[PDB]
Amino acid sequence: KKQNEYAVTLDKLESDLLQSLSEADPATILDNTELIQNLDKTKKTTIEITEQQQKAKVTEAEINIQREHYRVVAAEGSMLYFLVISLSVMDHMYQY
Amino acid sequence: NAYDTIMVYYHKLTAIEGRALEYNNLEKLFELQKSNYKQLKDCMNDLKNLKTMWDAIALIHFQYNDWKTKPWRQIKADILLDTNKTLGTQIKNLPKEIRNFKGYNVIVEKVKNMGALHSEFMEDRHWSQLKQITGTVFDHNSLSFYFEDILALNLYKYENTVNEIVDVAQKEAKIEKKLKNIEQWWSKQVFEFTEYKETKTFASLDNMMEVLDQHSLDLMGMKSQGKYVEFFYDR
Amino acid sequence: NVKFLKENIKSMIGDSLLASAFVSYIGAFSAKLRLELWKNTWLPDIITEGIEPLKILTTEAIKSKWKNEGLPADPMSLENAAIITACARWPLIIDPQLQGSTWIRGKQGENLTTISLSQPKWLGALTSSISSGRAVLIEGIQQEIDATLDPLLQRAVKKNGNQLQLEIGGDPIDYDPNFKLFLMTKL
Amino acid sequence: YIEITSTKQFEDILEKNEYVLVDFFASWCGPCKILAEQFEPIKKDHKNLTIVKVNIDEEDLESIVESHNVSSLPHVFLYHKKTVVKQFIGNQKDQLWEMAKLS
Amino acid sequence: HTTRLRYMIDIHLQRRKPILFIGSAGTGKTAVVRDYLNSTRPEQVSHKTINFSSFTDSLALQKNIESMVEKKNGRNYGSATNKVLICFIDDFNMPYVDKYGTQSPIQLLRLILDYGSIFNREQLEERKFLQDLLFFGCLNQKSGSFTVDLRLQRNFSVFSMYTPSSDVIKTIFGSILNAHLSTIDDKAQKMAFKLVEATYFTFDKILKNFPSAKRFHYQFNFRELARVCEGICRTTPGQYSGGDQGKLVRLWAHEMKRTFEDRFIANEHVEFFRRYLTEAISKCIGEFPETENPIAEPLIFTGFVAAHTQCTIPVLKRVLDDKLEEYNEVKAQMNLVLFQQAMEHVSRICRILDMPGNNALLVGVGGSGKQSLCRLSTFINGFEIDQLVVTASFTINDLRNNLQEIYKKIAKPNSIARVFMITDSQIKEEQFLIPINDMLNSGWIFDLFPKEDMDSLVSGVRNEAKGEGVDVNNLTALTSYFLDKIRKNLKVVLCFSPVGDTMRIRSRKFPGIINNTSIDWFHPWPHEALIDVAFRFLEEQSISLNMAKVHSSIRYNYTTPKSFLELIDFYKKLLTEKRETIQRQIQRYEMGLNILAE
């Protein structure tokens, strides 16, 4: 959920990139100090995206190491469940 | 005033056509390249003519004028498909000179300008809508008949305003019919009583109940889609 | 980034037709069927290829928000999360088990309703839904289609003055551009 | 007087007859009164001439109108041996009589 | 065979004996009845004929019977100034059978035959009789027209026949050919007759293979082949350019394709038929006369003088564009592309309209506007168009009011009728199908226009009939001529979906549908036309191949041709919006560069 919100946090940067020319309507943009800070904000996100890439690599690699630990019995219990769900067709009352 | 100038230069062109005819004679005498030179007879054909098409315009335009006189009921601009711009298309089909002469071209400009509204579907509200949307300040459409009003308004250029008024009117059409049922079929009905052991009492309830519920269904289906609700909203 | 795009216009030709045909068609065929369709993605006629359309559809961010809404981490759920983005014609949600509907409901948690077919207020809840500009879900399909919703099943958006309104039954009901609809079947 | 609304029949009239005086006319008036009351006398006086009356207002006859390039409703044409000899317009009794006399 | 028929019919009429006959529908038996009746009428005795539907019972019999006369022994029938009255049964097995297999008209006939009587159904002793009436009729075999019960045929003498022979077909239709070809340029009698024997040979083999069991719409009939020979004599009769028999042979193959390629279902059928057709033409005459005719078609517009006979592709393109624009002038436009199959469909509509009296069929789904193509084609035909309005009050009374309005606007103006359109959805009440069948066969309905309505309708049509030259004294030739003109005016088109299982059910439920109309297939979309629309919409080549190849590959398990139209729209959108998003991000990157550089 945290790599989830951070990739959405990039969307705010995508917004603040777009407004950099949009909010000022491409006028009197030179003397506006707010854009400089918007550029500095883009630098913050650049390392925030850099935090997104490292976390995505270190965690999700570990997540798969955690997921495989049981995966085979999951897909087992998966199709085992669909099979026992299909038992009701050959006899009424055989619903779980 | 244009005619006179064009008459002088057309008489010069008649000397032209005489000389062109004598040069045509010269090709008949000795072989030459007559087909090489684009000699048109449209000019001298209009010299002999153009009263033809001028009176044509007189009849299209004095139909416009007899129509400018047609009273507000006698005019037909919308139950008439298109006499005005049909005849204008005729003028356009007529030769190049003609469509360009601004006798024909003044009446063709008028045709493109002028080029349902008198049916049951139309109502006073649609007449006032015509007034407001056409921007016409006249007690003319909103009153009881239409003449010399939305020709002073261009009929073809604002044919679309008239068209959308026709459209909202033919959409209103269903309220012209279906809510007459409630008032007729209700007014021709009365409580009915019958004696139940020395007491008169309402009876034949089924017909009255269907009457009332059909009334309500008409009211619902009317308060539905059509903005025309105002035609019987109070009822 | 400009360089990436100036190529990307040219790279957009071909692979885009492929995603469009599959997303419009194959949304309910077997997964194994879709695989051979991607290996048979008209390769000698589609003339980049290492730009597989599963990633051009969405980003990890939108998939991410939907996980928070309860979306599975599972491929088949991912392409189903991609087909719901397309809303030209209303969806048929074949839902052999429930979490598909639960996440869709988890994803639709603002203005919404749910009506069964054999419902007394069925037409009234229909009218209130289309007039309010909300969602609506239908689950007990009984594997059948109704006649009175067929003018609503198709985009019969007729002009009624400035407003757009539609016939569902005797009452001619108003549309709402905010309104949406979904269904759900099981078997 | 001949009253015809079809171009093909007008053409066959011209094929089979020697002289034809056609009056394009309207069921309404223009600047002056109709010549239809003076036009039947000229037919009754010159039976050697096929005198035709042709009414532009008819939609079937709009074809004859377009073919002869007739635009003026009152339009009297003199044809001899299938070809146009003369044409004038306006409800002009003198012009109609001159055309009939020189037909 | 019909000479034996004549021999029988003469003595039976002298005996005033009611008889029947067994024979396939579409075997000109109605026409034999017409021949005999129009030969014998001559103010000696009146007549009447009646059609049936499954939802017909004794009721309609009593009404349509009880039309007219008051004699003694209560209201009953009397040949005032005549000898007897006669009625005919068009279709016999048509009326519905209960689960015990009985029809109330059969029991009404029990009563009428054994007693010469009737009981009016209003609650009284209103019990009337019959004095002079004769019954006749005919019917095809058991399939799917039911068997007669022995209580009936014991009182009705019948006899059988079977399909005519090659010598008979040659006799009649080659006699018609003698007439038509000897009228103009008779120097080709031998090759024409040999063309007709090629027709018979191809017919024989295609019926040898393909059986009517393949689909319900499979049938070959004498009246079909009569329509074929009539399309042959339809040809521009002048055509004084007899320079190649190949001209009339290519025209004839055009009518061949008109007859059969519209009906063929498996393209294997078309392969077989074209193979056999070119095989016959080659065993017959000529070198490459018909070896390939994909485009060749005798059209009408722009062919005759000032029409605006065969013509060419760019001329067709220009004239169809001009007529489409002229339609857009007055009516709202419909710019579905003029692709070659659309233009072929337009020409099919043209020839169907060229055929008057009878109507045709359109078994094809919507989506594309087939009704809009009908609007365009009927606009270039310049005739009147109409279509019923669907309401919640979809009452037979409403159809009847529209129909009275229809008959007023068809009889008083004395002009062409309004060409009609109906779809499967438009007709919810199944009872609406019966008056439509009456439109199909008679073109009018009993008691929909009662006696005073008859007189008021024919008032002005009478005086105009005296103008054209039918006397007022006949008074029956008059009314027959009037309804004949009504048929010459009316044209109707019926749209269906081929997926509809109940299409076959209602075809068996109504014989007028399959007999009157013509079978045309509307058919998997023309792949070439798909390519055409694809590379045209580039206005907004390998790709135009590619998407159609995709659709042509999806066929394995399941596929849908219509969704390919919606996929064409879907990817047209996707192209627009994806290029637009590409532009949005181009501008975002451009302004990133702007701020970078600044």
XYZ file of C-alpha atoms in Angstrom, chain E:
598
model
C -52.217 -32.317 -68.100
C -54.200 -29.092 -67.900
C -56.148 -30.402 -70.902
C -57.314 -33.242 -68.662
C -57.933 -30.470 -66.118
C -60.203 -28.625 -68.569
C -62.090 -31.825 -69.411
C -62.773 -32.416 -65.708
C -63.642 -28.810 -64.844
C -66.231 -28.399 -67.604
C -68.422 -31.313 -66.524
C -67.922 -30.481 -62.849
C -69.204 -26.932 -63.406
C -72.148 -28.346 -65.360
C -72.868 -30.719 -62.467
C -72.513 -27.998 -59.793
C -70.337 -30.491 -57.908
C -67.710 -29.376 -55.370
C -64.234 -30.838 -55.971
C -60.674 -30.350 -54.710
C -57.120 -31.089 -55.881
C -53.687 -31.895 -54.444
C -50.659 -29.939 -55.638
C -47.580 -28.044 -54.497
C -47.907 -24.353 -53.747
C -46.277 -22.306 -56.465
C -47.301 -24.746 -59.216
C -49.418 -22.173 -61.037
C -52.621 -23.715 -59.693
C -53.903 -20.303 -58.610
C -53.137 -19.180 -62.161
C -55.085 -22.111 -63.626
C -58.008 -21.100 -61.406
C -57.683 -17.527 -62.688
C -57.576 -18.682 -66.319
C -60.670 -20.869 -65.945
C -62.621 -18.283 -63.938
C -61.892 -15.327 -66.217
C -62.774 -17.576 -69.155
C -66.121 -18.666 -67.694
C -67.390 -15.585 -65.824
C -69.030 -13.691 -68.735
C -71.964 -12.528 -66.567
C -73.252 -16.092 -66.080
C -72.471 -16.721 -62.375
C -70.583 -14.834 -59.660
C -67.591 -16.152 -57.688
C -65.431 -15.597 -54.613
C -62.069 -16.740 -53.268
C -60.647 -16.725 -49.746
C -57.233 -17.117 -48.099
C -56.485 -18.576 -44.668
C -54.157 -18.208 -41.710
C -53.524 -20.438 -38.720
C -55.481 -17.964 -36.568
C -58.516 -18.466 -38.777
C -61.611 -20.295 -37.555
C -65.248 -20.686 -38.544
C -65.714 -17.030 -37.548
C -64.104 -15.290 -40.516
C -65.753 -17.864 -42.785
C -69.212 -16.838 -41.586
C -68.438 -13.131 -41.973
C -66.726 -13.091 -45.387
C -69.453 -15.474 -46.510
C -72.349 -13.492 -44.993
C -71.488 -10.385 -47.008
C -74.630 -10.326 -49.213
C -78.111 -11.293 -49.971
C -81.559 -11.382 -48.314
C -83.764 -14.132 -49.717
C -86.552 -16.229 -48.220
C -86.010 -18.757 -45.408
C -84.155 -16.076 -43.481
C -81.029 -14.235 -44.582
C -79.388 -16.671 -47.013
C -77.883 -16.900 -50.479
C -79.741 -16.460 -53.733
C -78.419 -16.055 -57.268
C -80.533 -13.068 -58.208
C -80.229 -12.994 -62.029
C -77.474 -15.660 -61.738
C -77.465 -19.432 -61.218
C -75.353 -20.205 -58.107
C -72.553 -18.834 -55.924
C -69.018 -20.263 -55.767
C -66.141 -19.849 -53.316
C -62.539 -21.044 -53.463
C -60.028 -22.040 -50.780
C -56.513 -20.764 -51.504
C -54.829 -22.667 -48.655
C -56.480 -25.622 -46.918
C -54.193 -26.882 -44.130
C -53.538 -23.321 -42.950
C -56.023 -22.998 -40.025
C -54.820 -23.939 -36.563
C -55.402 -27.474 -35.307
C -56.163 -28.071 -31.649
C -54.160 -30.673 -29.745
C -56.737 -33.168 -31.071
C -56.229 -32.001 -34.663
C -59.464 -30.248 -35.578
C -60.391 -26.947 -37.203
C -63.665 -25.163 -36.504
C -64.033 -24.309 -40.234
C -64.148 -28.065 -40.866
C -67.088 -28.425 -38.474
C -68.739 -25.334 -39.938
C -68.395 -27.131 -43.273
C -69.908 -30.244 -41.688
C -72.943 -28.164 -40.732
C -73.170 -26.258 -44.034
C -72.781 -29.367 -46.198
C -75.029 -31.789 -44.322
C -77.787 -29.238 -43.599
C -77.282 -26.254 -45.907
C -77.596 -24.185 -42.765
C -75.941 -21.918 -40.202
C -76.509 -20.571 -36.687
C -75.607 -16.923 -36.146
C -73.636 -16.719 -32.928
C -75.492 -13.919 -31.134
C -77.663 -15.250 -28.322
C -80.993 -15.961 -30.029
C -82.708 -18.409 -32.386
C -81.046 -16.560 -35.297
C -80.649 -19.728 -37.338
C -80.244 -19.105 -41.068
C -79.820 -21.310 -44.137
C -78.077 -21.616 -47.508
C -79.543 -22.069 -50.985
C -76.839 -21.890 -53.690
C -73.159 -22.384 -52.887
C -70.286 -24.384 -54.350
C -66.948 -25.073 -52.668
C -63.507 -25.627 -54.190
C -59.886 -25.602 -53.108
C -56.428 -27.118 -53.371
C -53.379 -27.879 -51.230
C -49.826 -29.237 -51.405
C -48.608 -32.436 -49.734
C -48.328 -33.312 -46.047
C -45.191 -31.196 -45.539
C -45.905 -29.155 -43.721
C -49.538 -28.878 -44.770
C -51.666 -31.260 -42.736
C -53.551 -34.365 -43.863
C -57.282 -34.357 -44.666
C -59.607 -36.525 -42.581
C -61.788 -39.049 -44.400
C -64.943 -37.181 -43.340
C -63.972 -34.508 -45.900
C -62.598 -36.110 -49.077
C -65.566 -38.483 -49.284
C -67.582 -35.370 -50.207
C -64.873 -33.891 -52.456
C -63.358 -35.530 -55.526
C -59.621 -35.003 -56.035
C -56.776 -36.253 -58.229
C -52.997 -36.001 -58.240
C -50.122 -34.908 -60.454
C -46.375 -34.416 -60.101
C -43.643 -32.028 -61.168
C -43.740 -31.081 -64.877
C -41.268 -32.476 -67.377
C -38.431 -30.933 -69.354
C -40.513 -31.097 -72.533
C -43.339 -29.195 -70.802
C -40.987 -26.524 -69.450
C -39.415 -26.103 -72.883
C -42.874 -25.964 -74.476
C -44.278 -23.135 -72.352
C -41.195 -21.045 -71.670
C -39.692 -21.501 -75.120
C -43.064 -20.424 -76.495
C -42.777 -17.262 -74.403
C -39.232 -16.999 -75.779
C -40.488 -17.366 -79.356
C -42.879 -14.496 -78.669
C -40.317 -12.166 -77.096
C -37.317 -12.880 -79.337
C -39.362 -13.064 -82.551
C -40.702 -9.639 -81.624
C -37.165 -8.218 -82.015
C -34.044 -9.777 -83.601
C -35.200 -13.383 -84.015
C -31.865 -14.541 -85.482
C -30.918 -16.250 -82.197
C -33.788 -18.681 -81.626
C -31.592 -21.791 -81.554
C -29.031 -20.381 -79.123
C -31.815 -19.004 -76.923
C -33.587 -22.373 -76.703
C -30.234 -23.994 -76.018
C -29.683 -21.423 -73.252
C -33.020 -22.530 -71.784
C -32.050 -26.203 -71.917
C -28.869 -25.146 -70.113
C -31.159 -23.613 -67.481
C -32.963 -26.936 -67.147
C -29.709 -28.909 -66.938
C -28.228 -26.684 -64.224
C -31.569 -26.782 -62.395
C -31.656 -30.581 -62.571
C -28.160 -30.980 -61.160
C -28.513 -28.360 -58.399
C -31.674 -30.118 -57.244
C -29.933 -33.492 -57.604
C -27.246 -32.478 -55.109
C -29.022 -28.493 -52.069
C -31.995 -30.521 -50.833
C -34.731 -28.527 -49.119
C -33.770 -30.229 -45.843
C -30.591 -28.110 -45.756
C -32.518 -25.029 -44.648
C -36.163 -24.020 -44.459
C -35.690 -21.319 -47.117
C -34.603 -23.951 -49.674
C -37.217 -24.446 -52.391
C -37.367 -24.564 -56.194
C -40.646 -23.744 -57.886
C -42.427 -23.355 -61.203
C -43.386 -19.793 -60.279
C -39.750 -19.014 -59.458
C -38.737 -20.116 -62.954
C -41.654 -18.096 -64.345
C -40.250 -15.038 -62.557
C -36.906 -15.901 -64.182
C -38.320 -16.000 -67.714
C -40.190 -12.785 -66.911
C -36.942 -11.107 -65.913
C -35.685 -12.345 -69.271
C -38.502 -10.678 -71.220
C -38.084 -7.569 -69.035
C -34.857 -6.726 -70.915
C -34.719 -3.519 -72.958
C -36.768 -4.909 -75.848
C -35.212 -2.691 -78.471
C -31.531 -3.596 -77.990
C -31.360 -3.711 -81.797
C -27.610 -4.289 -81.566
C -27.614 -7.994 -82.228
C -23.862 -8.275 -82.570
C -23.155 -10.919 -79.968
C -25.374 -13.517 -78.382
C -22.979 -12.963 -75.488
C -24.827 -9.715 -74.767
C -28.129 -11.429 -73.998
C -26.139 -14.296 -72.447
C -24.380 -11.984 -69.986
C -27.689 -10.271 -69.240
C -29.211 -13.721 -68.744
C -26.425 -14.685 -66.355
C -27.120 -11.430 -64.523
C -30.682 -12.599 -63.954
C -29.242 -16.004 -63.010
C -27.177 -14.379 -60.266
C -30.152 -12.202 -59.256
C -32.106 -15.430 -58.791
C -29.580 -17.613 -57.011
C -26.609 -15.741 -55.494
C -28.966 -13.764 -53.264
C -30.279 -17.092 -51.959
C -27.079 -19.155 -51.703
C -25.787 -19.677 -48.163
C -22.544 -21.618 -48.335
C -20.134 -19.892 -50.698
C -19.641 -23.515 -51.721
C -23.157 -23.225 -53.175
C -22.005 -20.269 -55.284
C -18.884 -22.189 -56.317
C -20.962 -25.193 -57.395
C -23.491 -23.051 -59.250
C -20.935 -20.898 -61.074
C -18.981 -24.024 -62.012
C -22.111 -25.675 -63.415
C -23.250 -22.448 -65.099
C -19.989 -21.814 -66.945
C -19.835 -25.547 -67.716
C -23.265 -25.321 -69.339
C -22.447 -22.099 -71.190
C -19.323 -23.805 -72.548
C -21.117 -27.004 -73.563
C -23.589 -24.601 -75.204
C -21.863 -21.710 -77.101
C -19.260 -19.008 -76.924
C -15.717 -18.440 -75.724
C -15.486 -16.401 -72.499
C -18.943 -14.714 -72.729
C -19.728 -15.265 -69.048
C -16.344 -16.550 -67.833
C -16.295 -13.577 -65.431
C -19.057 -11.068 -64.619
C -18.333 -9.481 -61.223
C -19.354 -5.946 -62.200
C -21.577 -6.465 -65.226
C -25.181 -5.466 -64.529
C -27.933 -3.878 -66.653
C -28.818 -0.733 -64.705
C -31.466 1.912 -65.451
C -30.301 5.353 -64.335
C -28.012 7.315 -66.709
C -28.461 4.524 -69.275
C -31.576 5.647 -71.107
C -31.706 9.101 -72.677
C -31.596 11.735 -69.908
C -32.242 8.947 -67.386
C -29.793 10.358 -64.808
C -28.788 -1.322 -70.046
C -25.283 -1.652 -68.596
C -22.830 1.042 -67.489
C -19.509 1.471 -65.687
C -17.880 1.964 -62.277
C -16.938 5.690 -62.139
C -20.281 6.622 -63.696
C -22.001 4.589 -60.971
C -19.825 6.315 -58.355
C -20.634 9.828 -59.581
C -24.365 9.208 -60.023
C -24.680 7.594 -56.592
C -22.773 10.465 -54.974
C -25.019 12.994 -56.732
C -28.209 11.218 -55.665
C -26.911 10.919 -52.098
C -26.234 14.665 -52.002
C -29.673 15.399 -53.465
C -31.176 13.232 -50.717
C -29.144 15.136 -48.119
C -30.545 18.399 -49.507
C -34.140 17.791 -48.385
C -33.764 14.841 -45.984
C -31.226 14.296 -43.227
C -28.053 12.789 -44.649
C -26.849 9.219 -44.204
C -23.240 8.848 -45.342
C -22.689 5.126 -45.013
C -20.107 4.599 -47.716
C -21.032 3.790 -51.314
C -18.899 0.654 -51.346
C -19.366 -1.883 -54.124
C -21.605 -4.193 -52.094
C -23.684 -1.230 -50.920
C -24.126 -0.250 -54.571
C -24.999 -3.846 -55.484
C -27.565 -3.843 -52.663
C -28.937 -0.555 -54.009
C -29.279 -2.157 -57.451
C -31.022 -5.150 -55.869
C -33.491 -2.732 -54.274
C -33.840 -1.099 -57.702
C -34.841 -4.332 -59.441
C -37.123 -5.379 -56.571
C -38.920 -2.047 -56.946
C -38.945 -2.508 -60.730
C -41.047 -5.586 -60.050
C -44.551 -4.290 -59.173
C -47.463 -6.044 -57.475
C -45.413 -8.501 -55.429
C -42.876 -7.671 -52.707
C -39.568 -9.028 -51.379
C -37.660 -9.753 -48.175
C -34.625 -8.437 -46.263
C -33.223 -10.955 -43.753
C -30.355 -8.951 -42.299
C -29.407 -7.419 -38.946
C -29.402 -3.667 -38.406
C -26.509 -1.544 -37.189
C -25.862 -0.347 -40.690
C -28.969 1.415 -41.845
C -30.692 -0.900 -44.280
C -33.801 1.234 -43.842
C -31.605 4.255 -44.602
C -30.382 2.599 -47.794
C -34.074 2.048 -48.541
C -34.609 5.780 -47.999
C -31.826 6.566 -50.474
C -33.029 4.053 -53.074
C -36.689 5.063 -52.764
C -35.557 8.684 -53.026
C -33.820 7.999 -56.336
C -36.925 6.053 -57.347
C -38.831 9.217 -56.423
C -41.777 7.368 -54.880
C -43.710 7.700 -51.643
C -42.413 6.173 -48.402
C -44.097 5.362 -45.096
C -43.561 3.389 -41.892
C -45.861 2.637 -38.978
C -45.273 4.386 -35.654
C -44.753 2.160 -32.617
C -46.516 3.183 -29.400
C -47.557 1.613 -26.120
C -51.069 1.597 -27.631
C -49.948 -0.839 -30.337
C -53.528 -1.721 -31.174
C -54.868 -3.372 -34.307
C -57.263 -0.421 -34.311
C -54.260 1.901 -34.629
C -52.859 -0.078 -37.551
C -56.358 -0.003 -39.049
C -56.634 3.784 -38.746
C -53.215 4.187 -40.347
C -54.398 1.769 -43.052
C -57.602 3.691 -43.778
C -55.454 6.820 -44.046
C -53.183 4.794 -46.364
C -56.082 3.783 -48.602
C -57.367 7.344 -48.763
C -53.932 8.662 -49.732
C -53.575 5.856 -52.294
C -57.000 5.978 -53.953
C -58.042 9.638 -53.922
C -54.759 11.104 -55.292
C -54.659 8.223 -57.826
C -50.880 7.881 -57.613
C -48.119 5.499 -56.525
C -48.396 4.043 -53.033
C -46.147 4.608 -50.030
C -43.398 2.009 -49.917
C -43.577 0.464 -46.461
C -40.966 -0.831 -44.026
C -41.522 -3.322 -41.216
C -39.068 -4.954 -38.821
C -39.373 -7.887 -36.438
C -39.312 -5.540 -33.445
C -41.999 -3.231 -34.853
C -44.586 -6.042 -34.717
C -45.085 -7.266 -31.134
C -48.719 -8.395 -31.328
C -48.634 -11.587 -33.381
C -52.207 -10.907 -34.529
C -50.774 -8.048 -36.614
C -49.263 -10.649 -38.960
C -52.652 -11.701 -40.407
C -53.720 -8.336 -41.921
C -50.160 -8.056 -43.226
C -50.617 -11.396 -44.996
C -53.862 -10.000 -46.406
C -51.804 -7.063 -47.678
C -49.362 -9.569 -49.183
C -52.005 -11.555 -51.083
C -55.107 -9.397 -51.624
C -53.678 -6.004 -50.698
C -56.878 -5.192 -48.768
C -59.042 -6.642 -46.008
C -62.681 -7.691 -45.684
C -64.747 -5.469 -43.342
C -61.760 -3.139 -42.951
C -63.612 -1.225 -45.673
C -67.327 -2.120 -45.590
C -69.790 -1.654 -48.434
C -70.357 2.091 -48.032
C -66.577 2.359 -47.735
C -66.245 0.391 -50.985
C -68.514 2.851 -52.801
C -66.925 5.951 -51.258
C -63.424 4.700 -52.098
C -64.224 3.824 -55.703
C -66.323 6.953 -56.370
C -63.603 8.978 -58.105
C -61.566 5.985 -59.230
C -64.673 4.963 -61.200
C -64.877 8.211 -63.162
C -61.145 8.113 -63.851
C -61.581 4.507 -65.014
C -64.164 5.720 -67.531
C -61.504 8.232 -68.552
C -58.988 5.486 -69.293
C -61.677 3.342 -70.903
C -63.390 0.737 -68.701
C -67.168 0.898 -69.023
C -69.425 1.591 -66.060
C -71.718 -1.290 -67.034
C -69.311 -4.072 -66.027
C -68.970 -2.869 -62.404
C -66.783 -5.915 -61.684
C -63.991 -5.328 -64.171
C -64.032 -1.891 -62.533
C -63.351 -3.104 -58.984
C -60.873 -5.750 -60.152
C -59.034 -3.049 -62.116
C -59.037 -0.789 -59.051
C -57.486 -3.395 -56.767
C -55.096 -4.326 -59.587
C -53.939 -0.701 -59.662
C -53.624 -0.745 -55.866
C -51.331 -3.767 -56.199
C -49.373 -2.068 -58.994
C -48.902 0.841 -56.566
C -48.082 -0.891 -53.265
C -44.568 -1.967 -52.273
C -43.516 -3.258 -48.849
C -40.217 -4.482 -47.392
C -39.926 -6.833 -44.410
C -36.718 -6.929 -42.365
C -35.752 -9.966 -40.306
C -32.791 -11.364 -38.471
C -31.427 -14.669 -39.836
C -30.534 -15.700 -36.276
C -34.240 -15.733 -35.404
C -35.376 -19.311 -34.867
C -38.998 -18.152 -34.969
C -38.370 -16.801 -38.470
C -38.904 -20.367 -39.700
C -41.814 -20.738 -37.269
C -43.589 -17.669 -38.652
C -42.685 -18.653 -42.220
C -44.557 -21.916 -41.673
C -47.179 -19.846 -39.799
C -47.655 -17.652 -42.896
C -47.289 -18.987 -46.464
C -47.556 -15.565 -48.078
C -44.144 -14.648 -46.662
C -42.132 -17.281 -48.525
C -44.313 -17.474 -51.645
C -44.696 -13.755 -52.374
C -41.312 -12.407 -51.250
C -37.883 -13.367 -52.623
C -35.060 -14.978 -50.662
C -31.918 -12.855 -50.424
C -28.970 -13.484 -48.112
C -27.544 -10.628 -45.994
C -24.772 -12.659 -45.323
C -21.280 -12.326 -43.688
C -19.979 -8.848 -44.522
C -17.987 -8.504 -47.760
C -14.361 -8.626 -46.655
C -13.407 -6.392 -49.588
C -15.954 -3.857 -48.329
C -14.363 -4.048 -44.881
C -11.002 -3.244 -46.489
C -12.675 -0.361 -48.332
C -14.159 1.237 -45.216
C -10.865 0.672 -43.388
C -8.620 2.519 -45.825
C -11.250 5.193 -46.461
C -11.473 6.129 -42.785
C -7.789 7.078 -42.963
C -9.211 10.434 -44.102
C -9.921 11.086 -40.416
C -3.013 -0.036 -46.488
C -1.283 -2.772 -44.504
C -3.303 -1.739 -41.430
C -6.503 -1.861 -43.493
C -5.607 -5.429 -44.365
C -4.511 -6.173 -40.804
C -7.643 -5.434 -38.789
C -9.768 -7.473 -41.203
C -7.207 -10.288 -40.978
C -7.587 -10.117 -37.192
C -11.349 -10.523 -37.522
C -10.806 -13.315 -40.071
C -8.602 -15.114 -37.537
C -10.883 -14.824 -34.473
C -13.326 -17.297 -36.060
C -11.953 -20.407 -34.317
C -14.230 -20.789 -31.292
C -16.557 -17.769 -31.426
C -16.621 -14.462 -33.297
C -19.031 -11.668 -34.198
C -19.016 -9.668 -37.464
C -21.072 -6.802 -36.062
C -18.668 -6.221 -33.164
C -16.085 -5.756 -35.914
C -18.072 -2.687 -36.942
C -18.067 -1.549 -33.323
C -14.385 -2.506 -33.165
C -13.730 -0.364 -36.244
C -15.403 2.494 -34.373
C -13.605 1.531 -31.146
C -10.132 1.571 -32.692
C -10.961 4.693 -34.708
C -11.630 6.327 -31.347
C -8.561 4.693 -29.779
C -6.459 6.105 -32.635
C -7.878 9.604 -32.120
C -7.538 9.638 -28.327
C -4.146 7.888 -28.264
C -2.722 10.388 -30.747
C -4.285 13.148 -28.635
C -2.685 11.821 -25.435
C 0.589 11.571 -27.359
C 0.168 15.259 -28.181
C -0.596 16.125 -24.543
C 2.619 14.495 -23.390
C 4.556 16.082 -26.291
C 3.489 19.470 -24.965
C 4.340 18.440 -21.395
C 7.837 17.460 -22.513
C 8.178 20.606 -24.638
C 7.427 22.775 -21.629
C 9.784 20.699 -19.500
C 12.451 21.666 -22.031
C 11.290 25.291 -21.916
C 11.738 25.530 -18.156
C 15.001 23.565 -18.339
C 16.466 25.986 -20.883
C 15.195 29.093 -19.092
